[PDB]
Write a protein that binds this ligand. Sequence first.
Ligand code: 4WI
Ligand code: 4WI
Lengths: 298, 297
Amino acid sequence: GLRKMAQPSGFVEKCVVRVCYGNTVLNGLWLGDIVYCPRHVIASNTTSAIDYDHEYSIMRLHNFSIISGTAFLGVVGATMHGVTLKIKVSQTNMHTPRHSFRTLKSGEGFNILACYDGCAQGVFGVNMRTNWTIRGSFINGACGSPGYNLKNGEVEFVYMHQIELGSGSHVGSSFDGVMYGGFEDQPNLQVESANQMLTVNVVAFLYAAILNGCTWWLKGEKLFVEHYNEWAQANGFTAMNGEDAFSILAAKTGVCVERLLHAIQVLNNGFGGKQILGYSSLNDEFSINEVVKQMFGV
Amino acid sequence: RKMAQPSGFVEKCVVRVCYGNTVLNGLWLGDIVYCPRHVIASNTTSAIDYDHEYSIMRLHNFSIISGTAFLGVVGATMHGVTLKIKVSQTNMHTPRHSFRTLKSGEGFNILACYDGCAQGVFGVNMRTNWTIRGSFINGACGSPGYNLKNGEVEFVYMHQIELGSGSHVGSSFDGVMYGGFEDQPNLQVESANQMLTVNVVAFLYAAILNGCTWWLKGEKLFVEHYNEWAQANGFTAMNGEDAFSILAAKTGVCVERLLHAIQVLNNGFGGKQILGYSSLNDEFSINEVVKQMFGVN
Ligand SMILES: CC(C)(C)[C@H](NC(=O)C(F)(F)F)C(=O)N1C[C@H]2[C@@H]([C@H]1C(=O)N[C@H](C=N)C[C@@H]1CCNC1=O)C2(C)C
Ligand SMILES: CC(C)(C)[C@H](NC(=O)C(F)(F)F)C(=O)N1C[C@H]2[C@@H]([C@H]1C(=O)N[C@H](C=N)C[C@@H]1CCNC1=O)C2(C)C
């Protein structure tokens, strides 16, 4: 089978805190002696354009309350970096995991720990879409929820939740304070670009299908990558690139990528009542790495 | 969006259980390590006499590792398709917990583990044929299924076998295999899966709450009539329409109008989608819909 999994959340859970300032509560991430959180926690009035330089100049540190579980942390300073605050606290988080910070590229997979009131409530794997939004399930109080990847025994922190667009899509920032997609932490209408289906992931999905004995859709005709990309630009798919990355899957199956590109074109019109590993339509949720990991443990 | 509950409380309980050449996962709670009994079987490609295997078990063949610490085995007893291995060490990270047995259609979380280390977490439903749609390869046995409720962990599933169809079967922690399946390497076939009607209705209510209403008509289908159609078309009966009376009041749409949509939509969406799906979806319970959109349990 093929299931969209999250990487385990235990290491990240110990870092989530509640950040309160004046009349707002949201979540922060406590690493070392710093708590990271969205800067709009200090905005007194969010019904019109926020002058964050002004809000920062009037910010008073005694209005913060930072809570780890049931313990209060002492706040000693706070600086603004893009759309984030780095709040310096008086104790080191002794549960800080081995970590780094990374900025997601388009299509890259990660995990969201959905937090409310400083406490984790759900965890899920997700992909950064080409329009720099994600389909999260975030409601009131979710800001500051962290996105992460586990790699080589290290936690990479990649996302801090910030806003919900009118479409229902979700936008966050890196921990550098750069909002994905250049969206603003401002209460005005913002519209995202059209989403594209991630071709590299659909291809990985079709390989997984072959490996599971689901091959009714597979045919012998190939479609060259340059010809597929001409078709993809006009039909809402990303272009194919990095074909060599599929070598492990092509070897195990004996099916070249260009035969799967041909399949994408035909199956984009619908499955006609058939299913591929349980889906009634093409699926771009799984990367090459996830397919290889779940089928072969590599 | 399909999500799982956080895994941090369960992760501290997973251990590596090795007996001779076999390695799988165990669950360390108090001074007991729970794991599948086939860890002690000498040959798992032919029929297994577990009473024989238990009578020749030698405890020095066990190695149990939590993180990098070795646990000391002092006894082991067999209960159904599980072993309860008593160790000297009490797990100081044992959460408040209970053991519960899943009902047909009930949702829960799997922590997929290998070599005694968690690798992934995902939500699943116990299906009407007592299998789950998991994703496991060699070494996954003993991976635990859990729910977080009322400040405790409910442990509900221990992974055991993969059927020839790819469906997965586990046991409760009292050693009862879900569905009555055997921990034997023989051909066993599951019964036909049914679509969980209550979950489809929740999905359609979620569609209405997101203003996705192209499919919604005005005709009502009485519960008794729907159920007659469902028994012949691979759907479960509608039951407990009262839990949906909160959403019926909130949307102004009665369950009978959704039952009629299921019957119509089961023939296909005709190129349209519902919340991004091209066919009826039974993966989301009323609990999940309400938790994710309204924040309440
Ligand atoms: C959706 C809302 C209309 C409220 C607004 N959106 C837009 O103003 C936009 F459309 F312009 F983006 C919006 O997100 N905010 C308004 C205000 C902050 C942010 C906000 O409250 N964030 C929440 C953090 N706890 C997470 C949200 C809550 C609902 N679901 C979420 O994910 C700031 C931009 C300073
Ligand atoms: C799939 C396999 C053909 C190997 C077999 N299936 C059948 O015998 C059947 F089909 F009948 F069910 C089977 O699951 N097992 C053979 C042997 C144990 C069990 C087994 O290996 N459990 C794994 C635990 N680490 C679970 C994972 C799940 C994914 N793949 C696995 O191996 C026992 C039944 C004693």
